[PDB]
């Protein structure tokens, strides 16, 4: 009766349907996962989950001719979440190309691919994730955005040797790639008031483009416009 599987497709919610081909001979038809043999499903998906958990790009390239890329595992992780935590910017760029849901959320912890690239410390990956338009703002079960995460871990990286080093670099590169997304450096019209003293000086800032004035730490301002201010003071 049933010959082989040839396609997947998300029906309902995290529920699956496969495209079957036939030995009795008739035109290939869609059919619920709940309605088809274990191994025959397993035989279509295992080559897939192997490929991913080892970030095999070539393989993945082929196993996609007609496949629903956002298939989940036991913990609601899609293929993408894997290649992300492994640090394969090349894979990630490929599955993105395949329309994968960048903003997908797992069900053990509530994470996205950027929570993986973050946690697993893959900069060049995040780089790409953001390039292709991911949303950095997505929180998880712990309420953490991806950035707050890189902040937290780097709190607790070791300071031992050049092994424990490329770790610290990593978190910084991520934490800065991410910052360069939350934070712009917009030009100042005027600097209205001065608070704090010496170095911990905090300046009240008027924006050229519009809207409120706001206390920027004296660090997060320009040495050229901070001077222009305390000169008008004298």
């Amino acid at each position: 009766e049933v010959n082989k599987i040839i396609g997947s497709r998300t029906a309902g919610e995290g529920a699956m349907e496969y495209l079957i081909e036939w030995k009795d001979g008739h035109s290939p038809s869609w059919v619920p996962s709940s309605y088809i043999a274990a191994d025959v499903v397993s035989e279509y998906e295992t080559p897939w989950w192997t490929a991913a958990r080892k970030a095999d790009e070539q393989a993945l390239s082929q196993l996609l001719e007609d496949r629903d890329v956002d298939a989940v595992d036991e913990n609601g992780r899609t293929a993408l979440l894997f290649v992300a935590g492994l640090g394969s910017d090349k894979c990630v760029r490929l599955l993105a190309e395949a329309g994968a849901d960048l903003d997908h959320r797992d069900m053990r912890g509530g994470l996205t691919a950027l929570h993986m690239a973050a946690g697993y410390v893959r900069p060049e990956v995040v780089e790409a994730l953001v390039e292709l338009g991911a949303d950095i703002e997505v929180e998880d079960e712990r309420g953490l955005t991806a950035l707050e995460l890189a902040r937290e871990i780097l709190k607790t990286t070791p300071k031992g040797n050049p092994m424990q080093f490329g770790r610290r670099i990593g978190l910084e590169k991520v934490i800065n790639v991410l910052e360069g997304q939350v934070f712009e450096y917009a030009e100042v019209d005027e600097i209205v008031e001065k608070r704090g003293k010496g170095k911990d000086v905090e300046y009240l800032v008027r924006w050229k483009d519009g809207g409120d004035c706001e206390w920027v730490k004296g660090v997060h301002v320009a040495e050229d416009v901070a001077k222009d201010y305390e000169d008008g003071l004298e």
């Binding site: 934070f183 712009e184 100042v188 800032v205 924006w207 920027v216 320009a222 040495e223 416009v225």
Partner: peptide, 13 residues
């Protein structure tokens, strides 16, 4: 990590 000339850090909106 110095701020560009004539600018200051804010959140993106």
């Amino acid at each position: 990590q110095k701020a560009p000339p004539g600018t200051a850090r804010r959140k993106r909106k």
